[PDB]
Enzyme design. Structure first.
Site, PDB file in Angstrom:
ATOM      1  N   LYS A  30      -0.122   5.213  -6.194  1.00 13.72           N
ATOM      2  CA  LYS A  30      -1.222   5.145  -7.147  1.00 13.72           C
ATOM      3  C   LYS A  30      -2.146   6.352  -7.029  1.00 13.72           C
TER       4      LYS A  30
ATOM      5  N   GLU B  21      -6.691   1.001 -14.051  1.00 13.38           N
ATOM      6  CA  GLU B  21      -6.139   2.167 -13.359  1.00 13.38           C
ATOM      7  C   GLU B  21      -4.867   2.678 -14.025  1.00 13.38           C
TER       8      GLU B  21
ATOM      9  N   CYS C 240       0.814  -1.207   0.000  1.00 23.98           N
ATOM     10  CA  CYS C 240       0.000   0.000   0.000  1.00 23.98           C
ATOM     11  C   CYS C 240       0.854   1.266   0.000  1.00 23.98           C
TER      12      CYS C 240
ATOM     13  N   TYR D 294      -8.648  -4.504 -12.197  1.00 17.79           N
ATOM     14  CA  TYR D 294      -8.696  -3.122 -11.752  1.00 17.79           C
ATOM     15  C   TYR D 294      -7.336  -2.427 -11.866  1.00 17.79           C
TER      16      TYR D 294
ATOM     17  N   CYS E 206      -1.171   1.612  -3.110  1.00 16.56           N
ATOM     18  CA  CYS E 206      -2.351   2.439  -3.074  1.00 16.56           C
ATOM     19  C   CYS E 206      -1.957   3.916  -2.920  1.00 16.56           C
TER      20      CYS E 206
ATOM     21  N   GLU F  67     -27.439  12.404  -4.581  1.00 16.74           N
ATOM     22  CA  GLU F  67     -28.880  12.442  -4.311  1.00 16.74           C
ATOM     23  C   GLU F  67     -29.709  11.541  -5.241  1.00 16.74           C
TER      24      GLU F  67
ATOM     25  N   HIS G 170     -29.168  18.452  -2.572  1.00 16.20           N
ATOM     26  CA  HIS G 170     -29.226  19.053  -3.884  1.00 16.20           C
ATOM     27  C   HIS G 170     -28.308  20.279  -3.860  1.00 16.20           C
TER      28      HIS G 170
HETATM   29  C1  FAD Z   1     -28.777  31.779  -3.458  1.00 15.20           C
HETATM   30  C2  FAD Z   1     -29.542  30.508  -3.143  1.00 15.20           C
HETATM   31  C3  FAD Z   1     -28.939  29.290  -3.247  1.00 15.20           C
HETATM   32  C4  FAD Z   1     -29.570  28.129  -2.766  1.00 15.20           C
HETATM   33  N1  FAD Z   1     -28.844  26.974  -2.772  1.00 15.20           N
HETATM   34  C5  FAD Z   1     -29.488  25.844  -2.439  1.00 15.20           C
HETATM   35  C6  FAD Z   1     -28.828  24.569  -2.597  1.00 15.20           C
HETATM   36  O1  FAD Z   1     -27.742  24.442  -3.118  1.00 15.20           O
HETATM   37  N2  FAD Z   1     -29.494  23.467  -2.135  1.00 15.20           N
HETATM   38  C7  FAD Z   1     -30.838  23.560  -1.704  1.00 15.20           C
HETATM   39  O2  FAD Z   1     -31.403  22.530  -1.530  1.00 15.20           O
HETATM   40  N3  FAD Z   1     -31.430  24.716  -1.504  1.00 15.20           N
HETATM   41  C8  FAD Z   1     -30.845  25.856  -1.931  1.00 15.20           C
HETATM   42  N4  FAD Z   1     -31.518  27.004  -1.885  1.00 15.20           N
HETATM   43  C9  FAD Z   1     -32.911  27.033  -1.399  1.00 15.20           C
HETATM   44  C10 FAD Z   1     -33.900  26.628  -2.527  1.00 15.20           C
HETATM   45  O3  FAD Z   1     -33.659  27.501  -3.628  1.00 15.20           O
HETATM   46  C11 FAD Z   1     -35.303  26.817  -1.986  1.00 15.20           C
HETATM   47  O4  FAD Z   1     -35.372  26.214  -0.706  1.00 15.20           O
HETATM   48  C12 FAD Z   1     -36.335  26.130  -2.858  1.00 15.20           C
HETATM   49  O5  FAD Z   1     -36.370  26.723  -4.175  1.00 15.20           O
HETATM   50  C13 FAD Z   1     -37.681  26.256  -2.144  1.00 15.20           C
HETATM   51  O6  FAD Z   1     -38.849  26.029  -3.197  1.00 15.20           O
HETATM   52  P1  FAD Z   1     -40.175  26.745  -3.057  1.00 15.20           P
HETATM   53  O7  FAD Z   1     -41.139  25.827  -3.831  1.00 15.20           O
HETATM   54  O8  FAD Z   1     -40.526  26.981  -1.741  1.00 15.20           O
HETATM   55  O9  FAD Z   1     -40.079  28.109  -3.629  1.00 15.20           O
HETATM   56  P2  FAD Z   1     -39.510  28.775  -4.944  1.00 15.20           P
HETATM   57  O10 FAD Z   1     -38.628  27.969  -5.538  1.00 15.20           O
HETATM   58  O11 FAD Z   1     -39.136  30.162  -4.583  1.00 15.20           O
HETATM   59  O12 FAD Z   1     -40.687  28.977  -5.874  1.00 15.20           O
HETATM   60  C14 FAD Z   1     -41.827  29.843  -5.600  1.00 15.20           C
HETATM   61  C15 FAD Z   1     -42.359  30.224  -6.990  1.00 15.20           C
HETATM   62  O13 FAD Z   1     -43.601  30.962  -6.787  1.00 15.20           O
HETATM   63  C16 FAD Z   1     -43.612  32.038  -7.775  1.00 15.20           C
HETATM   64  N5  FAD Z   1     -44.579  32.973  -7.224  1.00 15.20           N
HETATM   65  C17 FAD Z   1     -44.424  33.737  -6.104  1.00 15.20           C
HETATM   66  N6  FAD Z   1     -45.568  34.270  -5.700  1.00 15.20           N
HETATM   67  C18 FAD Z   1     -46.435  34.060  -6.746  1.00 15.20           C
HETATM   68  C19 FAD Z   1     -47.806  34.527  -6.980  1.00 15.20           C
HETATM   69  N7  FAD Z   1     -48.471  35.310  -6.164  1.00 15.20           N
HETATM   70  N8  FAD Z   1     -48.357  34.071  -8.148  1.00 15.20           N
HETATM   71  C20 FAD Z   1     -47.640  33.361  -9.067  1.00 15.20           C
HETATM   72  N9  FAD Z   1     -46.404  32.872  -8.926  1.00 15.20           N
HETATM   73  C21 FAD Z   1     -45.837  33.253  -7.743  1.00 15.20           C
HETATM   74  C22 FAD Z   1     -42.199  32.479  -7.795  1.00 15.20           C
HETATM   75  O14 FAD Z   1     -41.902  33.285  -8.894  1.00 15.20           O
HETATM   76  C23 FAD Z   1     -41.454  31.141  -7.841  1.00 15.20           C
HETATM   77  O15 FAD Z   1     -41.097  30.669  -9.088  1.00 15.20           O
HETATM   78  C24 FAD Z   1     -30.907  28.221  -2.309  1.00 15.20           C
HETATM   79  C25 FAD Z   1     -31.570  29.442  -2.280  1.00 15.20           C
HETATM   80  C26 FAD Z   1     -30.918  30.592  -2.744  1.00 15.20           C
HETATM   81  C27 FAD Z   1     -31.672  31.891  -2.816  1.00 15.20           C
HETATM   82  C1  FAD Z   2      -0.821  -1.366  -7.894  1.00 15.89           C
HETATM   83  C2  FAD Z   2      -1.603  -1.612  -6.618  1.00 15.89           C
HETATM   84  C3  FAD Z   2      -2.527  -0.710  -6.184  1.00 15.89           C
HETATM   85  C4  FAD Z   2      -3.395  -1.019  -5.122  1.00 15.89           C
HETATM   86  N1  FAD Z   2      -4.387  -0.125  -4.843  1.00 15.89           N
HETATM   87  C5  FAD Z   2      -5.130  -0.356  -3.749  1.00 15.89           C
HETATM   88  C6  FAD Z   2      -6.073   0.640  -3.299  1.00 15.89           C
HETATM   89  O1  FAD Z   2      -6.168   1.741  -3.798  1.00 15.89           O
HETATM   90  N2  FAD Z   2      -6.879   0.300  -2.248  1.00 15.89           N
HETATM   91  C7  FAD Z   2      -6.657  -0.895  -1.523  1.00 15.89           C
HETATM   92  O2  FAD Z   2      -7.254  -1.005  -0.501  1.00 15.89           O
HETATM   93  N3  FAD Z   2      -5.843  -1.833  -1.952  1.00 15.89           N
HETATM   94  C8  FAD Z   2      -5.010  -1.581  -2.985  1.00 15.89           C
HETATM   95  N4  FAD Z   2      -4.067  -2.465  -3.307  1.00 15.89           N
HETATM   96  C9  FAD Z   2      -3.909  -3.706  -2.523  1.00 15.89           C
HETATM   97  C10 FAD Z   2      -3.069  -3.447  -1.241  1.00 15.89           C
HETATM   98  O3  FAD Z   2      -1.834  -2.872  -1.659  1.00 15.89           O
HETATM   99  C11 FAD Z   2      -2.841  -4.788  -0.574  1.00 15.89           C
HETATM  100  O4  FAD Z   2      -4.081  -5.470  -0.507  1.00 15.89           O
HETATM  101  C12 FAD Z   2      -2.344  -4.627   0.849  1.00 15.89           C
HETATM  102  O5  FAD Z   2      -1.050  -3.985   0.871  1.00 15.89           O
HETATM  103  C13 FAD Z   2      -2.293  -6.024   1.468  1.00 15.89           C
HETATM  104  O6  FAD Z   2      -1.329  -5.997   2.730  1.00 15.89           O
HETATM  105  P1  FAD Z   2      -0.511  -7.211   3.113  1.00 15.89           P
HETATM  106  O7  FAD Z   2      -0.255  -6.987   4.614  1.00 15.89           O
HETATM  107  O8  FAD Z   2      -1.136  -8.404   2.800  1.00 15.89           O
HETATM  108  O9  FAD Z   2       0.731  -7.262   2.307  1.00 15.89           O
HETATM  109  P2  FAD Z   2       1.867  -6.254   1.868  1.00 15.89           P
HETATM  110  O10 FAD Z   2       1.450  -4.992   1.984  1.00 15.89           O
HETATM  111  O11 FAD Z   2       2.396  -6.756   0.579  1.00 15.89           O
HETATM  112  O12 FAD Z   2       3.030  -6.471   2.813  1.00 15.89           O
HETATM  113  C14 FAD Z   2       3.791  -7.708   2.929  1.00 15.89           C
HETATM  114  C15 FAD Z   2       5.165  -7.263   3.453  1.00 15.89           C
HETATM  115  O13 FAD Z   2       5.926  -8.474   3.744  1.00 15.89           O
HETATM  116  C16 FAD Z   2       7.301  -8.210   3.329  1.00 15.89           C
HETATM  117  N5  FAD Z   2       7.861  -9.546   3.198  1.00 15.89           N
HETATM  118  C17 FAD Z   2       7.541 -10.471   2.247  1.00 15.89           C
HETATM  119  N6  FAD Z   2       7.999 -11.678   2.548  1.00 15.89           N
HETATM  120  C18 FAD Z   2       8.869 -11.465   3.592  1.00 15.89           C
HETATM  121  C19 FAD Z   2       9.794 -12.369   4.285  1.00 15.89           C
HETATM  122  N7  FAD Z   2       9.972 -13.630   3.969  1.00 15.89           N
HETATM  123  N8  FAD Z   2      10.480 -11.781   5.314  1.00 15.89           N
HETATM  124  C20 FAD Z   2      10.402 -10.443   5.575  1.00 15.89           C
HETATM  125  N9  FAD Z   2       9.571  -9.558   5.018  1.00 15.89           N
HETATM  126  C21 FAD Z   2       8.820 -10.118   4.023  1.00 15.89           C
HETATM  127  C22 FAD Z   2       7.124  -7.440   2.078  1.00 15.89           C
HETATM  128  O14 FAD Z   2       8.296  -6.805   1.666  1.00 15.89           O
HETATM  129  C23 FAD Z   2       6.035  -6.440   2.478  1.00 15.89           C
HETATM  130  O15 FAD Z   2       6.457  -5.203   2.924  1.00 15.89           O
HETATM  131  C24 FAD Z   2      -3.195  -2.227  -4.410  1.00 15.89           C
HETATM  132  C25 FAD Z   2      -2.197  -3.119  -4.782  1.00 15.89           C
HETATM  133  C26 FAD Z   2      -1.354  -2.803  -5.857  1.00 15.89           C
HETATM  134  C27 FAD Z   2      -0.207  -3.716  -6.190  1.00 15.89           C
HETATM  135  S1  AJ3 Z   3     -35.531  23.371  -8.957  1.00 14.14           S
HETATM  136  C1  AJ3 Z   3     -35.949  21.665  -9.169  1.00 14.14           C
HETATM  137  C2  AJ3 Z   3     -37.212  21.337  -9.452  1.00 14.14           C
HETATM  138  C3  AJ3 Z   3     -37.557  19.962  -9.938  1.00 14.14           C
HETATM  139  S2  AJ3 Z   3     -39.303  19.523  -9.504  1.00 14.14           S
HETATM  140  O1  AJ3 Z   3     -39.803  20.431  -8.390  1.00 14.14           O
HETATM  141  C4  AJ3 Z   3     -39.358  17.777  -8.917  1.00 14.14           C
HETATM  142  C5  AJ3 Z   3     -40.417  17.023  -9.634  1.00 14.14           C
HETATM  143  C6  AJ3 Z   3     -40.478  17.057 -10.947  1.00 14.14           C
HETATM  144  S1  AJ3 Z   4      -0.254   0.972   3.971  1.00 16.39           S
HETATM  145  C1  AJ3 Z   4      -1.077   1.461   5.459  1.00 16.39           C
HETATM  146  C2  AJ3 Z   4      -0.670   0.949   6.623  1.00 16.39           C
HETATM  147  C3  AJ3 Z   4      -1.115   1.548   7.922  1.00 16.39           C
HETATM  148  S2  AJ3 Z   4      -1.106   0.283   9.275  1.00 16.39           S
HETATM  149  O1  AJ3 Z   4      -1.107  -1.115   8.675  1.00 16.39           O
HETATM  150  C4  AJ3 Z   4      -2.621   0.488  10.303  1.00 16.39           C
HETATM  151  C5  AJ3 Z   4      -2.265   0.554  11.743  1.00 16.39           C
HETATM  152  C6  AJ3 Z   4      -1.328   1.379  12.155  1.00 16.39           C
END
Ligand code: FAD
Ligand code: FAD
Ligand code: AJ3
Ligand code: AJ3
Ligand code: CL
Ligand code: CL
EC number: 1.8.1.7
Lengths: 461, 461
Positions: free
Chosen positions: A49, A184, A41, A180, A46, A455, A450
């Site tokens: 990588k 990769e 690792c 894998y 890992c 989601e 959202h």
């Molecule tokens: C800057 C910003 C960023 C946000 N980011 C996120 C986010 O990332 N994630 C998230 O989940 N929430 C986010 N929110 C909140 C999200 O936008 C609101 O919670 C969500 O749109 C609520 O829906 P609503 O149906 O209550 O109202 P609205 O979406 O406001 O809709 C009400 C609608 O009623 C219409 N309307 C109003 N009164 C009348 C009327 N008298 N007659 C006719 N039409 C009318 C309006 O024009 C409007 O289209 C964000 C809000 C803002 C302002």
């Molecule tokens: C290219 C690659 C990428 C990987 N990517 C991931 C990843 O992203 N996520 C993940 O979870 N897994 C990944 N793996 C797998 C992960 O590396 C192994 O599953 C993990 O290291 C297993 O640990 P181990 O204790 O079995 O053996 P090892 O880590 O191989 O350790 C065995 C140790 O024993 C030593 N040894 C060997 N024989 C002797 C001996 N006779 N006397 C003394 N020392 C000895 C070796 O030198 C070594 O240091 C990857 C493996 C490879 C090769």
């Molecule tokens: S701003 C996102 C609106 C999508 S609708 O209110 C969900 C059902 C179609």
């Molecule tokens: S390659 C990651 C090794 C971390 S140790 O085997 C976990 C305990 C210290």
């Protein structure tokens, strides 16, 4: 012959995890390590990588730059610079580990362990002898490469190991394999500007994954400009003046087999599987059970067939992931030194992220596995496909595909599968839910966030 | 007087959600809209906001470019270009909504509804009259601005509404307010290169959030180069030759009040709260109950005090979020036209993301709220703070902070709070778990995904 409570062979993920916990619980522990602490690792896996994947997504965001109202920008990646930073960060972690082991008074033994023919279980390193009541084998795996006898020139290729010694960006790469690691590597190399082909034996990559993911990932590789060579196999590799030349057969279904040559190849990378590190351990001296590929056989408690000897992690060949190695190592240390006799790792619903572009998150059962297990009538899938709002204003497109596999009348969620932007940080929370036996109702009654990609998993219909 | 099953006032998030579901369930529905379909989320809110946030994070990744081995790159943001794309995407959504309403044979009535003095509940628009058995008030809110009588020159400032008519990047911005909208606007504007101050009445932003988030966010704003003017209030605003000039008092605790002037200000932005859209509805004609700020009073089923009249969303002043408006609108349509009498929205454990840099995810109770509710001895928090591996090779740093608030012996997770890279896509899954009553054990027995930020929430100690 020096004596400990706990001797750990291998200072990688599983070994260090288990050594540490045992020390916490008051054991006198030693770790044997032949190379660097942190194992696969940290050193060739890992951590390096991820740094290269982070770099690769910088490449993709360079592309989108002008679309976002910014100066059309521009070109040239310097591999040397990130390679240096990446090395220095790895070395940093090596020292962090040595230092934490030492602070915990876990002894480090430097060198290659093998077992001896002593009757007590006993190892030797540079031949001093060592023993404990409890020995953990945690020696990990290594990449497999073809023999010269099957494919002449095979040893001209590198492995993922060699990938991390690369000092420059290969102009032209051919990656062999469909798992894998292959995916990769192809994605990193292509993003950074290598002319990349990926050579696979069938028609799709990641064929053990849910077929939605398999299919979508094969498409997104093509779309990102990776040349996927389907139904193809290396027959041999030759050195030339301008690099390697690769002979492949392509044997597409219901067509004639065709041999072609890929010239001018700077990097041929074998990613065809990993083999366990057991050949040099003298296991046969104690009659420790392996399979035909040399994985160590354990029960659900990580026992070998020999009492007082254990194995965790890659060397056992099941769920080859760092956090699995860690959790199994920690659970075992609780069993041995806290006498928690029911301490074991559940190997079900273990989540995986594959760091492709975009990344894949998967946990639980494929739609296939679910059907085999529950029968076709008790399986319901929900799925979706959309373009993330990120891409609303870009020329470049990626999809997000999500799939929920559900079982039985209550629609227990037994599978989630996705690929998309952000899906790497998305998965952990959902895998918590899935381990709890969440049903689709539980998902549907969580209020959405959202606007996000995430989601969509709580608003499937 | 034209008659429907369901008359909906307001075609924003709640209104459209409820109109649609009711049509599905077989009602004859009409939506009244005075401006554009999609309301606040589509037009002046979450959708344009997200596009600008995406743009802003492009700005931050431009900075990190040279660190990742890429050409030192370079400068100049063109606001015009993304503004055009953003407008065109919003207009696209307007048409999507009109077209989906029409496909579902939901009538659109264009104009401003008010209620009449007819005895039957009846509205009129350009005065034609309209009625239904069931009328949903879903008129949303609007930004509040100070009166000229409190702060001379206040109407020289813009609101978030005006933010989306901005045709160029303000050279120098002053944002007033301390809530999520103010924070988001300051972060977008500063990232893209406006010299930004944020003027807040106390010492920290987001003071209704968990105090870890409040504190960390105030720090990260400072670190990103937003000037946070603490304990400060606008006293008046004047037009000058070179822009606006803003008079503030700063009144820091245990020091003397000091008046200063901010010259040369191109954009003064009021983000001090929202008021409901009820002033023009002639509510008093039917005796519909408001509070002192004109929110419509509803029960847990979205009933007003008047039978057959309902309200959802911002106009009720509780949980001012798009997905809340949607879910409440949909639940209500199930109650009225599917006669599901127990159909209502649970307003507990509603998750929020604030799109700062980096983003904030929060769900459930603050450590404060938990202590008030469970007593101090029954509350346990776990927390962590680290630098994401993204930043291992960059000069620029951000933190990830995470906090789990736990209740009682079993340590039910009643609160999660985080700010970090990726925390926007992180939250949804965890909020699913929290709605299920997940305990820390459930978290701890989910296998980690490595390497991610998200795996830290399942490995807290
Ligand atoms: C800057 C910003 C960023 C946000 N980011 C996120 C986010 O990332 N994630 C998230 O989940 N929430 C986010 N929110 C909140 C999200 O936008 C609101 O919670 C969500 O749109 C609520 O829906 P609503 O149906 O209550 O109202 P609205 O979406 O406001 O809709 C009400 C609608 O009623 C219409 N309307 C109003 N009164 C009348 C009327 N008298 N007659 C006719 N039409 C009318 C309006 O024009 C409007 O289209 C964000 C809000 C803002 C302002
Ligand atoms: C290219 C690659 C990428 C990987 N990517 C991931 C990843 O992203 N996520 C993940 O979870 N897994 C990944 N793996 C797998 C992960 O590396 C192994 O599953 C993990 O290291 C297993 O640990 P181990 O204790 O079995 O053996 P090892 O880590 O191989 O350790 C065995 C140790 O024993 C030593 N040894 C060997 N024989 C002797 C001996 N006779 N006397 C003394 N020392 C000895 C070796 O030198 C070594 O240091 C990857 C493996 C490879 C090769
Ligand atoms: S701003 C996102 C609106 C999508 S609708 O209110 C969900 C059902 C179609
Ligand atoms: S390659 C990651 C090794 C971390 S140790 O085997 C976990 C305990 C210290
Ligand atoms: Cl080392
Ligand atoms: Cl419209």
């Amino acid at each position: 012959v020096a004596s400990y409570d706990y001797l750990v062979i291998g200072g990688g993920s599983g070994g260090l995890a288990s050594a540490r916990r045992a020390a916490e619980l008051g054991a006198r522990a030693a770790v044997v390590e032949s190379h660097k602490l942190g194992g696969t690792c940290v050193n060739v896996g890992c951590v390096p990588k991820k740094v290269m994947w982070n770099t690769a997504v910088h490449s993709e965001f360079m592309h989108d730059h002008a679309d976002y109202g910014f100066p059309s920008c521009e070109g040239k990646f310097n591999w040397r610079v990130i390679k240096e930073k990446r090395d220095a960060y790895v070395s940093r972690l090596n020292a962090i580990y040595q230092n934490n082991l030492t602070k915990s008074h876990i002894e480090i033994i430097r060198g290659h362990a093998a077992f001896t023919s002593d009757p007590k279980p006993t190892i030797e390193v540079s031949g001093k002898k060592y023993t404990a009541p409890h020995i953990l084998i945690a020696t990990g795996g290594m990449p497999s490469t073809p023999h010269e006898s099957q494919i002449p020139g095979a040893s001209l290729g590198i492995t993922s190991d060699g990938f991390f010694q690369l000092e420059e960006l290969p102009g032209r790469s051919v990656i062999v394999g469909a798992g894998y690691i292959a995916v990769e590597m192809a994605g990193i190399l292509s993003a950074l500007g290598s002319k990349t082909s990926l050579m696979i034996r069938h028609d799709k990559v990641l064929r053990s994954f849910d077929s939605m993911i398999s299919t979508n990932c094969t498409e997104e590789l093509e779309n990102a400009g990776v040349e996927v060579l389907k139904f193809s196999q290396v027959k041999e590799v030759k050195k030339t003046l301008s690099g390697l030349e690769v002979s492949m057969v392509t044997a597409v279904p219901g067509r004639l087999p065709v041999m072609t040559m890929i010239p001018d190849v700077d990097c041929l990378l074998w990613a065809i599987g990993r083999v366990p590190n057991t050949k040099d351990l003298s296991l046969n001296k104690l009659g420790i059970q392996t399979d035909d590929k040399g994985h160590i056989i354990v029960d659900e408690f990580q026992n070998t067939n020999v009492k007082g000897i254990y194995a965790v992690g890659d060397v056992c060949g099941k769920a080859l992931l760092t956090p699995v190695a860690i959790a199994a190592g920690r659970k075992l240390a609780h069993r041995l030194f806290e006498y928690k006799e029911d301490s074991k790792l559940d190997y079900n619903n273990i989540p995986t992220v594959v760091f492709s572009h975009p990344p894949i998150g998967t946990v639980g059962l494929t739609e296939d596995e679910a059907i085999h297990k529950y029968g076709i009538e008790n399986v319901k899938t929900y799925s979706t496909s959309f373009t993330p709002m990120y891409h609303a204003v870009t020329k470049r497109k990626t999809k997000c595909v999500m799939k929920m596999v559900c079982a039985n009348k209550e629609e227990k969620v037994v599978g989630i599968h996705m690929q998309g932007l952000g899906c790497d940080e998305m998965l952990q929370g959902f895998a918590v839910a899935v381990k709890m036996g969440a049903t689709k109702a539980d998902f549907d009654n969580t209020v959405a966030i959202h606007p996000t990609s995430s989601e969509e998993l709580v608003t499937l219909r």
